[PDB]
Structure formats: C-alpha cells, structure tokens
Amino acid sequence: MTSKMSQLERNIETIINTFHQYSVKLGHPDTLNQGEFKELVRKDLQNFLKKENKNEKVIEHIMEDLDTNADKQLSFEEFIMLMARLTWASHEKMHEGDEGPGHHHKPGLGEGTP
Amino acid sequence: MTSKMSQLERNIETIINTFHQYSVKLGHPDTLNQGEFKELVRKDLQNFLKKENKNEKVIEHIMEDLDTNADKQLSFEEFIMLMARLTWASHEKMHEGDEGPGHHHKPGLGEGTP
C-alpha cells in the first residue's frame, strides 16, 4: 500500500488547504473573515449553495452567526459547522430520485449535469 | 462550463456520502454511533488520525465528548467539528517544511510517501 492516505482523508485535506487559501488572505490563515468567506462560498460553494450565492446577506448571516468567537471571522471549527449545514442540504440530495422518483431534486445539490 | 461543481464542493460531497456510508449502517444514516465512528476513523482517518487510531479510548472520547446531542452518537454537525479538530492537525501539516525546514513533520499528517 503506497497510498496510505484514504478517500476521505485526501478529500478533507483538499478542503482544508483550499478553504485555507481563502483563509490565508489575511496571512497566517487562521479564519475566514466576511470577505474571505463570501468569496469562498462565491467560488467553490457557488454551486452547492447557489441559491444562497444569489444573495450576499444570506452569506453574511453564516458569516457572523457562525462566528462563535464573535470576531466577524470563522475559525476552522466555525466554518466546519458550515460544512455540516451544507451536509444537511447534501443529505437531502443524498436521496437520489434516480432509484425511484417521487419528486426530483437537481443534481449534486442544484446542479445541471448531462 | 459543463462541470458547474467545484473542487471543494465535490470534495465535500465525497466526504458526506462516504462518512454517511458509515452512518448509514443504522439505516437512515443520521449519525455515527460508537461503532460506526470508530470504523470511520479506523478506515479513512486511519492515516490522519493514525496516532489516535492506535488507541480505541481516544476515539471513544471523540465519540461521546463530541456527542453534543448526548445520545452516544454523532450528527452531521457533531462529526463535522471532528473534521475541524483534524483541520487543526492538518493546519500543523500545512506548514510544509519543504519550503525551508526548521523541523520536519511527516507527510499529509503522519504519512510516509516516496
């Protein structure tokens, strides 16, 4: 086994460093501030949170409501719970209608895929 | 743009459904219980949390200490903060010594990669 690393672990690492590229805009990337968080959602989550991406104030809500440390910033733990909120959304997408549809939801969350 | 999906979003989705395969062992996968969480860490996080993976009691701690809903289970939000704990660890790995080493840490977190 050359690849000790696993599917989830690599996936987490990829998330961590990319989220941190938005976080690193302040230097030692220890957070996502209002601007960094908005951009983060605007670029990568633009699809999963696309409905949310259409408004700035909704993102502003996650921006500071999740700001448990109350600095208008998001620490690893704070933005990570954002991923849980999004997990609940992807939980709803997890019920793929393709097995037997009662009502069809859009791909990946809201996505249009041929 | 055929791939509306983004690097982080796909990465999150991959995490969600795989974590949920361990969560789905109970049916509607709404959690990771003690056994499901241990296995989850044991299989995928076995590398990132490898030092932790060597003990069961440490995983048991994350198992129920993170169990904010106090059912000896981990909801999406509860296991997601686990990923933040692991984010702090990967934050330490994020300081890749390869740019200019003062002290070298093992790859990806603890990994040995040629």
**Residue B81, Cβ neighbours under 10 Å: how many?**
21
Instruction: Transcribe A20-50 into DSSP letters.
Output: HHHHGGGSS---EEHHHHHHHHHHTTTTTTH
Structural domains counted in chain A: 1
Q: Is B2 exposed, middle or buried (0-12, 13-18, 19+ CB in 10 A)?
A: exposed
Q: Are A23 and A29 in contact (CB under 8 A)?
A: yes
Instruction: Mutate one of B2, B8, B92 to test the A interface: name it (highest A CB count within 10 A).
Output: B8
Contact criterion met (CB < 8 Å) for B18 and A5: no
Q: First CA to last CA across chain A, in angstroms?
A: 36
**Structural domain that includes position A44:** 1-114
Query: φ and ψ at A74, to 5 degrees?
Result: -130, 115
In angstroms and rounded to an integer, the radius of gyration of the C-alpha atoms of chain B is: 16
Instruction: Please report, for the domain that includes residue A65, its CATH number.
Output: 1.10.238.10
- Distance (Å, whole) CA A109 – CA A75: 25
Q: Is B92 annotated as a binding residue?
A: no
Considering CB atoms only, which of A6, A40, A108 is closest to B47?
A6
Contact criterion met (CB < 8 Å) for A80 and B76: no
Query: What is the DSSP code (8-state) at residue A105?
Result: P
